[PDB]
Amino acid sequence: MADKIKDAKIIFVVGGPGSGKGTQCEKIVAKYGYTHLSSGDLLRAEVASGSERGKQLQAIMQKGELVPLDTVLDMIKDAMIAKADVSKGFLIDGYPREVKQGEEFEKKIGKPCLLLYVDAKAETMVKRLLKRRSDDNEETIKKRLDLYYKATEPVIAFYEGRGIVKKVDSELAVDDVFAQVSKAIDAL
Numbered sequence: 001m002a003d004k005i006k007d008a009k010i011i012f013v014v015g016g017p018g019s020g021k022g023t024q025c026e027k028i029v030a031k032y033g034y035t036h037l038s039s040g041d042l043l044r045a046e047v048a049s050g051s052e053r054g055k056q057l058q059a060i061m062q063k064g065e066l067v068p069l070d071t072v073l074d075m076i077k078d079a080m081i082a083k084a085d086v087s088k089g090f091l092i093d094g095y096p097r098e099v100k101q102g103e104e105f106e107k108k109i110g111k112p113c114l115l116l117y118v119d120a121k122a123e124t125m126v127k128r129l130l131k132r133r134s135d136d137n138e139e140t141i142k143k144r145l146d147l148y149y150k151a152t153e154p155v156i157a158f159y160e161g162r163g164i165v166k167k168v169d170s171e172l173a174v175d176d177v178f179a180q181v182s183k184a185i186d187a188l
């Protein structure tokens with residue numbers, strides 16, 4: 001499974017809170033059949049388990065802060081292994097969010113062939129979150145934004161240098177955004 005995974009198409013999806021990551025990923029799953037792994041969903045699944053670990057994660061995520069790298073990466077890796085036998089490709093949604101998170105993923109799992117940069121303005125994100133969990137109040141949204149611009153924007157730079165970033169314009173209507181997404185995936 002390790003080797004299957006290292007040989008799979010691996011797509012990173014990066015974007016600010018409320019930018020449209022999950023929305024576009026669900027469209028990618030429906031059309032292309034990738035195995036969707038949301039870091040948020042995996043973390044919230046742990047919270048919902050009622051485990052002691054979940055309670056810890058709850059406290060972190062409700063404050064809008066980043067969970068320890070090893071915790072989220074281990075979750076994803078295990079999730080990839082469990083799906084490795086049946087998976088046609090992996091869609092990694094909301095990881096990496098730090099340059100170090102990308103590096104450790106490449107060390108422990110494999111190399112991305114594509115990064116979809118789901119690009120939107122902060123203002124757009126804020127109103128999208130507002131119009132739509134426990135991380136939803138004003139203060140938390142701001143911390144989430146802060147962290148994104150501080151920690152996660154360097155990830156885009158990293159993979160632009162790698163040469164695998166395709167920017168999609170998330171200010172467009174969802175289907176027009178997806179048309180950009182499709183163009184990038186069809187090219188793989």
Ligand SMILES: Nc1ncnc2c1ncn2[C@@H]1O[C@H](COP(=O)(O)OP(=O)(O)OP(=O)(O)OP(=O)(O)OP(=O)(O)OC[C@H]2O[C@@H](n3cnc4c(N)ncnc43)[C@H](O)[C@@H]2O)[C@@H](O)[C@H]1O
Nearest residue numbers: 017018019020021022023039040065066067094095128174
């Ligand atoms: N790697 C990691 N390392 C450490 N900690 C981590 C971590 N990953 C997660 N965590 C922790 O978990 C927390 C949650 O993170 P996480 O769940 O991973 O990311 P998020 O950005 O907070 O997720 P969102 O669902 O809020 O945003 P989204 O981009 O998916 O937008 P969506 O498609 O739903 O859309 C939002 C709204 O906008 C609408 N919408 C989407 N696109 C459009 C469009 N084009 N036009 C109009 N409306 C649109 C949608 O219908 C919807 O209503 C993190 O803060 C962190 O604490």
